[PDB]
Amino acid sequence: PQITLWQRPLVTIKIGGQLKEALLDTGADDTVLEEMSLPGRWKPKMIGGIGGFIKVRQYDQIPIEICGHKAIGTVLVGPTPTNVIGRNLLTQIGCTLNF
Amino acid sequence: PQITLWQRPLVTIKIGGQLKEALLDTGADDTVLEEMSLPGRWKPKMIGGIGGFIKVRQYDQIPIEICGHKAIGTVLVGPTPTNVIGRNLLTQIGCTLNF
Numbered sequence: 603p604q605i606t607l608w609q610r611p612l613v614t615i616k617i618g619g620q621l622k623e624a625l626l627d628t629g630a631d632d633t634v635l636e637e638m639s640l641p642g643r644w645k646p647k648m649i650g651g652i653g654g655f656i657k658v659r660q661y662d663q664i665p666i667e668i669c670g671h672k673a674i675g676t677v678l679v680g681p682t683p684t685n686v687i688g689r690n691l692l693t694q695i696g697c698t699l700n701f
Numbered sequence: 702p703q704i705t706l707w708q709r710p711l712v713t714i715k716i717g718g719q720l721k722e723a724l725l726d727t728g729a730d731d732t733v734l735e736e737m738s739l740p741g742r743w744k745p746k747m748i749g750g751i752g753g754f755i756k757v758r759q760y761d762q763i764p765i766e767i768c769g770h771k772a773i774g775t776v777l778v779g780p781t782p783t784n785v786i787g788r789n790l791l792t793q794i795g796c797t798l799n800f
């Protein structure tokens with residue numbers, strides 16, 4: 603698709619058997635989701651943005667579907683104010699910026 | 702151009718006759734730059750990121766070139782971790798997301 607930026611670019615994702623809404627975020631290195639369960643090993647991480655840092659759990663090799671596009675990658679889970687899809691997964695679905 | 706997302710989408714901007722580096726950030730409603738001088742009066746704004754809220758100075762109707770593309774719009778100035786170009790200006794330069 604071509605996604606306009608007049609509005610926030612929100613999409614449906616499927617992850618861990620759940621459907622969630624998330625923001626396609628070219629400014630984000632990492633994908634970060636609100637608290638949820640994921641299977642397998644994790645390790646703690648601090649990530650920073652406007653306003654400072656939060657602590658998250660880092661899960662690797664997590665399958666995700668974004669707009670019907672399957673990918674696998676690292677998902678961070680913690681007290682983010684909003685669900686963001688970062689570059690680590692945007693690359694995998696072939697997402698580009700164009701102007 | 703078409704910008705892939707394997708690296709941070711950093712571009713050169715020009716504002717107040719000076720070149721700076723900034724991040725093209727579809728997850729950002731607004732454009733926020735690190736401390737700098739701009740002309741005219743400013744208004745208060747509080748913006749929220751992953752780590753919480755910061756106070757910024759809002760300047761309106763500021764000329765800014767982004768990758769050589771001319772825009773004129775609202776620029777926020779404050780203690781951001783990096784210069785970010787948000788949707789308010791990404792729409793002026795005709796940016797979309799595509800996959």
Ligand SMILES: COC(=O)N[C@H](C(=O)NN(CCC[C@@]1(O)Cc2ccc(cc2)C/C=C\CNC(=O)[C@H](C(C)C)NC1=O)Cc1ccc(-c2cccnc2)cc1)C(C)(C)C
Pocket residue numbers: 627628629630631632633634649650651652683684686688724726728729730731732733748749750751753782783785787
């Ligand atoms: C609607 O408000 C906003 O548009 N906020 C924006 C914003 O923070 N949006 N975020 C999107 C993520 C912004 C950013 O790309 C901005 C950003 C910050 C630092 C850096 C790059 C880009 C570089 C430093 C380290 C790397 N950090 C990151 O890559 C992080 C991580 C999320 C991966 N990236 C970012 O945090 C998502 C976000 C959206 C809403 C909100 C909080 C939010 C809304 C209402 N109330 C509280 C918080 C976060 C502003 C930049 C204008 C503050």
Ligand SMILES: [Cl-]
Pocket residue numbers: 674675676690691
């Ligand atoms: Cl990854």
Ligand SMILES: [Cl-]
Pocket residue numbers: 696705
């Ligand atoms: Cl590619």
Ligand SMILES: [Cl-]
Pocket residue numbers: 773774775789790
């Ligand atoms: Cl504007």
